[PDB]
Design a binder for this molecule. Structure first.
Ligand SMILES: O=C(O)/C(=N\C(=O)[C@@H](CS)CCc1ccccc1)c1ccc(Cn2cnnn2)s1
Ligand SMILES: [Zn+2]
Ligand SMILES: [Zn+2]
Length: 216
């Protein structure tokens, strides 16, 4: 329904939000971020379509920022929908080796650059990628911004419900959420993909929801 919106969240950090009607769920927002590092912009999750990705990129370009790259938190289209367009514009794209393999298995275009491991610095000491383990999907990773203490949790952060479990790993999620909460209790802001920004308590709520889902 509403168009893509881009609003400031904190210094050098913007939240981009698109909306989608999802069968069985109603209107659902999709939040991603744009992080600025000295005159350059990094996309944390791409929008869902090539046209929303062009819009997002153009909004920062028109303000003098060069798009240095994008990182997708997991393989579903709401995080990677923009990789094809970014690659066509020769803008560096990034995703974990697991994410690219899922994209490949899925007949989707892959990120141009990959990484693996528990932690990976997209930008040394400024934009870190952390893999807590399987949860919402097998490959989901989060993005941490040290200065502002902002954690982009993506589709892993599910404080009020787990959402679509089609590619989830219900067995592993609680372990994954425990590790994530231990790691980022220091977060001032946690930005979920599908719900409002919150504080570190969202890590606890996600652990609870995951625990709850393993039972039933
Ligand atoms: O599981 C999910 O993360 C998500 N579903 C999807 O399949 C999503 C990819 S992860 C595709 C739909 C989509 C695409 C663009 C923008 C918003 C939603 C959600 C469905 C409904 C949600 C709301 N909420 C979560 N737990 N209870 N309800 S989140
Ligand atoms: Zn997903
Ligand atoms: Zn999602």
């Amino acid at each position: 329904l509403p168009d893509l919106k881009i609003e400031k969240l904190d210094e050098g950090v913007y939240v981009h939000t698109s909306f989608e009607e999802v069968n069985g769920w109603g209107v659902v927002p999709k939040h991603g971020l744009v992080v600025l590092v000295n005159a350059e912009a990094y996309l944390i999750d791409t929008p869902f379509t090539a046209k929303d990705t062009e819009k997002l990129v153009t909004w920062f370009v028109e303000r003098g920022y060069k798009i240095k790259g994008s990182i997708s938190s997991h393989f579903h289209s709401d995080s990677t929908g923009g990789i094809e367009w970014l690659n066509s514009r020769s803008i560096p794209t990034y995703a974990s080796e697991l994410t690219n393999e899922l994209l490949k298995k899925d007949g989707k275009v892959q990120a141009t650059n990959s990484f693996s491991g528990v932690n990976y610095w997209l930008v040394k000491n400024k934009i870190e990628v952390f893999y807590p383990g399987p949860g919402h999907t097998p490959d989901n990773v989060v993005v941490w911004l040290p200065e502002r203490k902002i954690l982009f949790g993506g589709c892993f952060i599910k404080p009020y419900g787990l959402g679509n479990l089609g590619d989830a790993n219900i067995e592993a999620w609680p372990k994954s959420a425990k590790l994530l909460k231990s790691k980022y209790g220091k977060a001032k802001l946690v930005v979920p993909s599908h719900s409002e920004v919150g504080d570190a308590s969202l890590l606890k709520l996600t652990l609870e929801q995951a625990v709850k889902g393993l039972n039933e």
